[PDB]
């Protein structure tokens, strides 16, 4: 379920997460109702770091954000905009190009 996938996202191993994101997008694609049930938690985990150490990890997160963006349409995402920009600003203003 989702709670299993949420645990797979916070796992220490980076390769463990890679299987989760691919399976995640398939699950919400089958059931759009997964979106509104737990909107707060899904956004927090994917937006948590926004700067991995392997290139494809962000790409999988970006493709998840590519797929997840059409469903969420404002209101709910409005107050975590400072939150996402916090990880965004730190990553843009970072030593590594």
């Amino acid at each position: 379920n989702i709670k299993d996938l949420l645990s797979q996202m916070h796992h220490y191993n980076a390769g463990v997460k890679q299987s989760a994101l691919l399976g995640l997008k398939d699950l919400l694609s089958q059931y759009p109702f997964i979106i509104d049930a737990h909107l707060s938690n899904i956004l927090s985990e994917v937006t948590a770091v926004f700067t991995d150490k392997d290139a494809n990890v962000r790409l999988a997160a970006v493709q998840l954000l590519q797929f997840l963006a059409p469903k969420i349409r404002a209101e709910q995402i409005s107050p975590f905009f400072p939150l996402v920009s916090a990880h965004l600003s730190s990553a843009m203003t970072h030593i590594t190009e």
């Binding site: 379920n1 989702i2 709670k3 059931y31 109702f33 997964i34 049930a37």
Partner: protein
């Protein structure tokens, strides 16, 4: 009367224990009316949203009545005629986000009823309203 308690509660309220069992009984029976509209009489159709709004607000403000209401809603004492009615209500209250944490604390009570509904309806047809019941519980909140 449902409106008064919805519009009078404060942190200093000393709500009596002799009135809570009365309120829970009066709430579900009114809730039963909304579900069995079955069209028919056109008069008893416009008076749906108003009753539904005040009915839902009474459980949000009173955590205890929700437990009292769900402590009596069970099976093995009512025929299968009312089973679609209770099944629709139980799955519907899982929606309406204002009442998530209230149902979260009463997960055990709701879970026991879930098995009961599936229990007597073992050898039967799919009954889509029952198929959605299991998935919606696991989808809209954790299992």
């Amino acid at each position: 009367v449902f409106g008064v308690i919805c519009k009078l509660l404060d942190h200093t309220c000393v709500v009596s224990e002799t009135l809570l069992p009365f309120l829970a009984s009066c709430c579900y029976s009114l809730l039963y009316f909304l579900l069995t509209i079955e069209k028919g009489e056109a008069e008893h159709l416009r008076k749906r949203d108003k009753l539904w709004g005040v009915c839902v607000s009474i459980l949000a403000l009173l955590p205890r009545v929700l437990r009292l209401m769900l402590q009596s809603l069970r099976v093995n004492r009512v025929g299968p005629e009312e089973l679609p009615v209770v099944g629709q209500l139980l799955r519907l209250l899982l929606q309406h986000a204002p009442l998530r944490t209230h149902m979260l604390t009463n997960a055990i009570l709701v879970q026991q009823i879930i098995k009961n509904i599936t229990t007597l309806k073992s050898g039967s047809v799919q009954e889509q309203w029952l198929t959605d019941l299991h998935y919606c519980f696991n989808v809209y909140i954790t299992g």
